Amino acid sequence: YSFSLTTFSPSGKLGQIDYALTAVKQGVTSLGIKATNGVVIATEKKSSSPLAMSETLSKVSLLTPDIGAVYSGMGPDYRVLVDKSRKVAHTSYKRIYGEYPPTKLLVSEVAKIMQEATQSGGVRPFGVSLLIAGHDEFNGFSLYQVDPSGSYFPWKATAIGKGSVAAKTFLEKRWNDELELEDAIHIALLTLKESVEGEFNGDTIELAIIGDENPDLLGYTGIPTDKGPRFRKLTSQEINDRLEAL
Amino acid sequence: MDIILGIRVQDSVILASSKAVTRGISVLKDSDDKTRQLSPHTLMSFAGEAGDTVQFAEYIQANIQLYSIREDYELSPQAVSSFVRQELAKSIRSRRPYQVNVLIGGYDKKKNKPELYQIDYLGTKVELPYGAHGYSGFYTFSLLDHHYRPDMTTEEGLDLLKLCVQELEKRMPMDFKGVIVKIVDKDGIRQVDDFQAQ
Amino acid sequence: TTTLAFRFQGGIIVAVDSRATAGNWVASQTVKKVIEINPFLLGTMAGGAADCQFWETWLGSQCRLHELREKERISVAAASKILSNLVYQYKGAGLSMGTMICGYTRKEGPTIYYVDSDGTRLKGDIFCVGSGQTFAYGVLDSNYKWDLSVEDALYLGKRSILAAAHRDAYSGGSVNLYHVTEDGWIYHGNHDVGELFWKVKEEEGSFNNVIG
Amino acid sequence: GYDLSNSVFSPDGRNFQVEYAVKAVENGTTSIGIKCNDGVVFAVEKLITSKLLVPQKNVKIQVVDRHIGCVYSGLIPDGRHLVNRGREEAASFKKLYKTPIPIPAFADRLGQYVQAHTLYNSVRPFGVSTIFGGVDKNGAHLYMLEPSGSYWGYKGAATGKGRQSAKAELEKLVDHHPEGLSAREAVKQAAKIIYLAHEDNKEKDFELEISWCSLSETNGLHKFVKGDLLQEAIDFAQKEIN
Amino acid sequence: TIFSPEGRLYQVEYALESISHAGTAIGIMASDGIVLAAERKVTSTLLEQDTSTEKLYKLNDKIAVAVAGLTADAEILINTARIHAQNYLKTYNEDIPVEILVRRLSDIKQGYTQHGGLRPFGVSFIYAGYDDRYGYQLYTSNPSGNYTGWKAISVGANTSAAQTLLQMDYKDDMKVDDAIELALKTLSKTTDSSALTYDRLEFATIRKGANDGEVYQKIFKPQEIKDILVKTGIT
Amino acid sequence: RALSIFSPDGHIFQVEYALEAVKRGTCAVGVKGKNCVVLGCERRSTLKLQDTRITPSKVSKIDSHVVLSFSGLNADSRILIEKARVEAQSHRLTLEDPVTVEYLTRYVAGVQQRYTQSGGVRPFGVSTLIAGFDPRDDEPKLYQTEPSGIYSSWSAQTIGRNSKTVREFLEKNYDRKEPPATVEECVKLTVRSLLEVVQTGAKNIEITVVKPDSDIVALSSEEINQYVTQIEQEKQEQ
Amino acid sequence: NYDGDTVTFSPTGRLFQVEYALEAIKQGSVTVGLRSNTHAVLVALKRNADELSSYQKKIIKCDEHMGLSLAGLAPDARVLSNYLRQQCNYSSLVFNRKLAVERAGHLLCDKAQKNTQSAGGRPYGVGLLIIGYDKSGAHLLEFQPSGNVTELYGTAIGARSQGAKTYLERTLDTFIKIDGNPDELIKAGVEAISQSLRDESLTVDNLSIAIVGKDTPFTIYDGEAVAKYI
Amino acid sequence: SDPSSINGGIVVAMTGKDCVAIACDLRLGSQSLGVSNKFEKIFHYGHVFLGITGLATDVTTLNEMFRYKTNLYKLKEERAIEPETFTQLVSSSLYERRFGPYFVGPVVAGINSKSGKPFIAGFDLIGCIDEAKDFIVSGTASDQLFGMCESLYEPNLEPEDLFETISQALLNAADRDALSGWGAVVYIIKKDEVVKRYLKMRQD
Amino acid sequence: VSTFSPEGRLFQVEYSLEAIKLGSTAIGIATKEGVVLGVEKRATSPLLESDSIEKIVEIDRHIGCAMSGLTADARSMIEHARTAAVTHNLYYDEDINVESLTQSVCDLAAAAAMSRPFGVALLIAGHDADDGYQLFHAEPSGTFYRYNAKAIGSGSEGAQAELLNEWHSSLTLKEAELLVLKILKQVMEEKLDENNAQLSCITKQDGFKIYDNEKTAELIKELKEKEAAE
Ligand SMILES: [Mg+2]
Ligand SMILES: [Mg+2]
Ligand SMILES: [Mg+2]
Ligand SMILES: [Mg+2]
């Protein structure tokens, strides 16, 4: 199967890409909200049975100490994409400049992966869409969304999957360019609540942020150039503490 | 080794190359041309190992000629030379390096100035008023350093080469059977067939 | 070994000796040092016997292929650049050969190219190669004139070899002569040096120091 | 359309091309094996298409290494292939471990290879089923392998056309002799069971072929049943056949 | 990569279609500069246009290109573009002539056309570039791998519309300030949405300021587009 | 995967269809005089606002004494040209003599032929008119190559849309006894032929003349126009 | 639907392509093979396309002790014999051992099989009768592109082969005992090839005979030398 | 035979108060024969300077290489590369050829446009990074240079003073090296501006 | 492309043969005084220079071949044929046998590791010491046959039939020349002149010679006269 599986249809559409976009559309909702001094990305831990254990499924992942990703679509396709993402972060970057890549660049690389899936012989596009949030010395904070086409674009706030439209709408009304992190968290939570069907608490939600540096999560004291990672995932407790303030 | 000298006056570049090819104990030929015209306004002279010498030259020629066709344009001497340096710089770290040294004299029709480039087998390139490879420099530089002037006419340079060729024939142990001289100027490349007596 | 080829009015003269040695041991006095590439081209042998015999025989083939492809006699220049380029491909491997590719075509006229395992290809009017070169050059240089006649020229080459066969220990046996013309080459015999030295001495008066 | 390409799962999760391969198997000669008390016997039905066949020559059973016996039913050539690879797979084991390949091990090797041919549409499964086994460091072993790459260990096993008749006979043996069965007995028995099983193909005269691998009768090596010992069983079968 | 009974390359033809559904990009070649303008596809109040780059890309300090098609397919072609640029520079120590870069990029696309079995790239490019041999040049390359140079041109949505508007207002002796205006006008009349707003535009120029010598590529910042807009009167 | 294959009727569809693309391409023609060859072509007019200065012209130099023009997919041609140019230098380098028009042709032809029996590659949508003069010779050469790989020489020939029509013009307007014995008339004839299809147009036609020993020159928009005028006159004078 | 490749078993478990290949054999001239306990003959009725051509050579020597007759797609026969020549050669060079006919058979089978299990390939479409004398006597083998090889006292293959196959199927008791005399064995070989004739009688260009045995290396008798057998 | 001493040449770089300086001689020679007196060994990609001493052909190659690399860096990251970063790049780029290296000794100098912190560094032919806040030396006269630097150098000098210091260091050190001299160039680098001055010296 | 039909034939091969039937008639006749090869040019217009049509080529001094079908496909085949004769001369210092040469060509044919079969056939005629003058026809199948005379291409059906009639084991070079001429005339849509037919022959003494238009015309004429007899 060495020929492109994704071909151009007479109307000018890339069949497989739109279909992958459909798969994405059915996935659980996830959102990202970019504040001034941070970014938050959240999703819902759709437990497929209470027998499964919630924690053992990181829907939100650290790509570099300053970049996280959340998705909507087919989890497996995401899981392998995160692996490759963390990898390329090093190969095409930390091993050449001694520092992790900047969000847009990593994002750009990830995109490149997905595009290949859109054109290489014998494969199908990834059935996922990711919201990648991060920070870097020169570009500050950013949030990006990446599609199976490979297309990516930045946002001030957005949501994908199931309740995307409703959510985008709510976000569109609450977001403004003067938002402090806690607030966007708040909004993330609020926005989350409306797309969530059943119990809404610290064990069914997953919030992660990209903010100030956490020295306590470094693992060592001594070298002062790197003050720690910016990506921090929220604890069940921390999430609930905020929920209680609904 | 063979003698390869070049001197760029004000409106042109003159190159002189010994006319002798020695293989072991005998002199095989006393009328060799150790140069190839890269483009109608650039010439390259060369000296070094038996086969590598012509092979490299011809390869470079072909490739410059091809660029000329594909683009309907004549690369500047500067371009032509950066191209050569790279090819040499590539061969020093190959399986078997071309042991070749060259001089590239060209008239840059765009800037309206003459240009002489000296590149050794290692890919070391340098732009100079006059230059030579091997030992030729040793005998002549003192003369060149002394009598050279930027505003020299084609004729003044030809005489300086003459004086240089004289020193070589006086102090150098091997008989290089004389030199073939050529000038690269705005009107092209001509061979001063009068350097046996001028 | 001593081989010469020189260009002139009537064409090309190729003359070679026929001695092969393995140290001080004379392995053969009857070797053919002229590889008949094809009816129009001549190649000489010096350096490695195998290398020349082989690659020039092969050259003989490549030329044929060319003459089928283009329906035109391959030029010596082309003929020689093939061998030459081939030889340059193996440079460093240890090929040993130095040869003259001789031919007379309409387009080029009579032509002689010196090609060697170092990758040298040269066009010239006179060439001698082998341990006995300097001796043949000596004779050639002084009696060489373009206006020579086929008969004299044959002799000149024949003699130049004689010269070398006398002084050089590694050359001798007999001289083989070849005249290359535009209609092809013509063999002009194998002349045993033994018999030839006495005859030439007697007739010419040279080699006086030798008693006989 | 789910039965045109190999690796394709149908809406019910079956690989049709495999099942078709099985049919090629069914359409073939019958063969069996009887794991006995300290060995195993193999036997197969060689159908004599014409007087022109040179008797007792087109051997069909095959040995792998020196202690494994192999017999299969279906597209004969496909069998041979399966065996050659068996041989390469066995050599490779010995070269590196010194001890000849254990039957469980060997089977799995053959298993994994066949299973592999049901993974890509560029390949067709094997049109044969193989019964094989032998003696090793700890017991006799008899296995049968189907085109899906599925295999299991047996007390007795058979395949091909006379398959049901044969299985029936084997079932009898298992219930009547849970103790075991001497190699000699199992030999004759197989001879019989083949004769019996031959009835589902009762139209052509046949040539029986038996082999065994016994820890007391053949030192653990695979040998063919020929001469006195073969005739004995041929007659033992011709007897209880009526 | 096959032929139709009519003598057309399906996938190529279809690719061009995909392209026609893409935002509009325009390149207008003035006498003292070149303009490139592009209307952005799918937006929102929340999309960050500030830190965005989706249709106007820098290839080399002297060549920029405008994109119409799959953003991702584009970036692949671009990266290699940027690379061929540098290779030439290393090899010759002179900046790569625009046509050379353009012809090279085209040749890749064509490859996908002739062999391999891979879907062509859903992209068309407008190249605005300068070089010491032909000065300013405007080029265009599409999926068939075909390329040509223009005085003014557009790609993407509503070509005939815009092409017809340009052919109307363009004149040999134009000036950048005028080409900018024209660009905006044309986009303005060929949009598929309410009204041209800064947030939906991408604008860039390649001018050779008289008070110097090297060409300067200026990719307009959001505010500047908003500014250049008021002046031209789109308000 | 084998794309170019035989059909029940003995045809290689892809090659056959390749020709169609040739027909869709503009016209190109070349007729050879007594000591020259000319090649004319009509310019494409799908959209107009072109910058003639730079746009890849239709007639290309393979070497200083050999040119090629074609009719077909413009992209597919470029490749044929490069491969030809590169082979032109290689011949020089190894045979110490530039290619003969025939050789160059046979080279270009074989390349196309190859694409007709190679997997994963579709034939070239192109036919070429190659012309020039052999080194140190004066007899003009005009050759034609098609996607099948077939090639041959022509006193005059044309390819591209409406080639049949103009071919006819030539079939009777060119006599192999008095080939256009002057640059001027050969041009005339080519123009005349070209007019029959071009449809009254100056910039519509581009004419290139090739003379012995690397003497090649394309006529400017106006030099041609002058011929056009004098032709419409030898039409209106009746 | 199920006859597009060899990688597709039909619903009844057949490989059509193989089967179709087997049918390629039936459109080739008949070739007979028969052996005694001291010789093996190959009588192959050669075929002509017009009355101005050659009667295609059906017999190929594979080693001084073995050879084969082909019926079907010649190319394939060349490929297969050549492979057979190589394997015979390998046995000689490396073990100074003559390759056992049975062994050769095992080889052809294995070779054919590979072409009946992989996408893109095609079964071989030619049958072969291989005769050869070795350490264990005279041998005759019949090879079919399905990959099946069988050792026989005699046989024939091709158009109308079934005629000679019955002759031999009855004449067995008679030829299996033609030891010490090759002429007879051949005569039988011809007599057999004639019970599958119809077009006309076997002529001097029609006939092709190959013999091999105890003190006789694989020899090809074509034309003239077979005259005494009609 | 030691490629690092065929063409000769030296480079040195120093830091001062809100500025850094990097200087180099201009001789290009072939063993004993001086061949050119105009072979600058300092290059820049934006506001970052890279001086390279060593086999001249590699000096040329490497320069061309980093330009190339620093250019794509700019296109991809939309910003100019910083000292610290270029350094890692140099190092990794050199170690990439660990078993057939470029016989060179690079020195990097520049000022990070964001922090303003002066920065210089040096490496050996395979990437071994040397990061000292004082001075870095490389070339056929490293010994001489170190000796000079160690004595002449002191911290926090002003652009004007550091200039003298580094010039002297370069100058005197070169005077004791056979393979260096024939001219010297000095770059005084400040956040905003950069001045380049050629020095007068013995032409022997 | 390697798929068998229910009849047991290779599709692309059968189709390949059809494409050949669409090509110019090629005829060769083999005598004891030589072998003649003649072809029909068939120019797609009178502007085309009749001499630039190459359908009879020299493989080597003692071997020439005529072609018919998609002629471009034949380029590689000639190249290979030439290289092989040459190579054989190099390694053995002798002339390759016509059969070997041919076989070498066919050996190339079936290599379906080139997307499709060759759409062209060849008439290889040559001479070697051991088997005298020989004529061979090579098909894209990979198969080849020796004939005494043979025609291929569009008019091959009638031509073959006529050959069958005119050929006898004793014609002279001249005779055959005429026949080829004749038969060429009988099947050519256009009238046979020296600018649209081409004759060639190969003899022991002079080898492969392609006849110059002038000589051919003299025969064409000599033919018109001998024919307008009764
Ligand atoms: Mg002597
Ligand atoms: Mg040091
Ligand atoms: Mg010093
Ligand atoms: Mg000094």
PDB file of N, CA, C and O in Angstrom, chain C residues 72-75 104-111 182, chain F residues 97 136:
ATOM      1  N   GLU C  72      29.553   5.462 -37.035  1.00  0.00           N
ATOM      2  CA  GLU C  72      30.677   6.326 -37.405  1.00  0.00           C
ATOM      3  C   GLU C  72      31.940   5.828 -36.692  1.00  0.00           C
ATOM      4  O   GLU C  72      31.865   5.418 -35.529  1.00  0.00           O
ATOM      5  N   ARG C  73      33.089   5.835 -37.376  1.00  0.00           N
ATOM      6  CA  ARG C  73      34.334   5.382 -36.756  1.00  0.00           C
ATOM      7  C   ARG C  73      34.652   6.221 -35.550  1.00  0.00           C
ATOM      8  O   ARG C  73      34.635   7.457 -35.615  1.00  0.00           O
ATOM      9  N   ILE C  74      34.923   5.551 -34.438  1.00  0.00           N
ATOM     10  CA  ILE C  74      35.225   6.248 -33.205  1.00  0.00           C
ATOM     11  C   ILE C  74      36.533   6.962 -33.407  1.00  0.00           C
ATOM     12  O   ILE C  74      37.442   6.446 -34.057  1.00  0.00           O
ATOM     13  N   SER C  75      36.593   8.179 -32.904  1.00  0.00           N
ATOM     14  CA  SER C  75      37.785   8.985 -32.995  1.00  0.00           C
ATOM     15  C   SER C  75      38.802   8.465 -31.986  1.00  0.00           C
ATOM     16  O   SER C  75      38.434   7.979 -30.921  1.00  0.00           O
ATOM     17  N   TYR C 104      44.442   6.848 -37.072  1.00  0.00           N
ATOM     18  CA  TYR C 104      44.423   7.819 -38.147  1.00  0.00           C
ATOM     19  C   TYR C 104      43.010   7.887 -38.710  1.00  0.00           C
ATOM     20  O   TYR C 104      42.555   6.968 -39.391  1.00  0.00           O
ATOM     21  N   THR C 105      42.310   8.972 -38.409  1.00  0.00           N
ATOM     22  CA  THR C 105      40.957   9.149 -38.902  1.00  0.00           C
ATOM     23  C   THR C 105      40.918  10.361 -39.794  1.00  0.00           C
ATOM     24  O   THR C 105      41.790  11.221 -39.731  1.00  0.00           O
ATOM     25  N   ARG C 106      39.851  10.454 -40.569  1.00  0.00           N
ATOM     26  CA  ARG C 106      39.638  11.569 -41.463  1.00  0.00           C
ATOM     27  C   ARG C 106      39.592  12.876 -40.678  1.00  0.00           C
ATOM     28  O   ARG C 106      40.367  13.788 -40.918  1.00  0.00           O
ATOM     29  N   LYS C 107      38.702  12.924 -39.703  1.00  0.00           N
ATOM     30  CA  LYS C 107      38.475  14.100 -38.867  1.00  0.00           C
ATOM     31  C   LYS C 107      39.710  14.626 -38.130  1.00  0.00           C
ATOM     32  O   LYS C 107      39.974  15.833 -38.119  1.00  0.00           O
ATOM     33  N   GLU C 108      40.441  13.707 -37.496  1.00  0.00           N
ATOM     34  CA  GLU C 108      41.615  14.033 -36.683  1.00  0.00           C
ATOM     35  C   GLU C 108      42.954  14.003 -37.388  1.00  0.00           C
ATOM     36  O   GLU C 108      43.849  14.789 -37.085  1.00  0.00           O
ATOM     37  N   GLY C 109      43.094  13.067 -38.309  1.00  0.00           N
ATOM     38  CA  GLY C 109      44.345  12.915 -39.005  1.00  0.00           C
ATOM     39  C   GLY C 109      45.031  11.865 -38.173  1.00  0.00           C
ATOM     40  O   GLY C 109      44.369  11.155 -37.413  1.00  0.00           O
ATOM     41  N   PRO C 110      46.354  11.725 -38.288  1.00  0.00           N
ATOM     42  CA  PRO C 110      47.065  10.715 -37.496  1.00  0.00           C
ATOM     43  C   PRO C 110      47.122  11.245 -36.078  1.00  0.00           C
ATOM     44  O   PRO C 110      47.374  12.436 -35.876  1.00  0.00           O
ATOM     45  N   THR C 111      46.899  10.382 -35.096  1.00  0.00           N
ATOM     46  CA  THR C 111      46.904  10.835 -33.720  1.00  0.00           C
ATOM     47  C   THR C 111      47.456   9.814 -32.749  1.00  0.00           C
ATOM     48  O   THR C 111      47.180   8.619 -32.866  1.00  0.00           O
ATOM     49  N   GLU C 182      45.218   5.958 -42.850  1.00  0.00           N
ATOM     50  CA  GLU C 182      43.807   6.261 -42.714  1.00  0.00           C
ATOM     51  C   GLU C 182      42.950   5.063 -43.068  1.00  0.00           C
ATOM     52  O   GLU C 182      41.860   4.910 -42.546  1.00  0.00           O
TER      53      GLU C 182
ATOM     54  N   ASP F  97      33.401  16.034 -28.060  1.00  0.00           N
ATOM     55  CA  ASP F  97      32.667  16.508 -29.240  1.00  0.00           C
ATOM     56  C   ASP F  97      31.214  16.685 -28.821  1.00  0.00           C
ATOM     57  O   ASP F  97      30.673  15.835 -28.098  1.00  0.00           O
ATOM     58  N   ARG F 136      30.514  21.123 -36.956  1.00  0.00           N
ATOM     59  CA  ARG F 136      31.281  21.242 -38.199  1.00  0.00           C
ATOM     60  C   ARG F 136      30.518  20.776 -39.444  1.00  0.00           C
ATOM     61  O   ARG F 136      31.115  20.235 -40.380  1.00  0.00           O
TER      62      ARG F 136
END
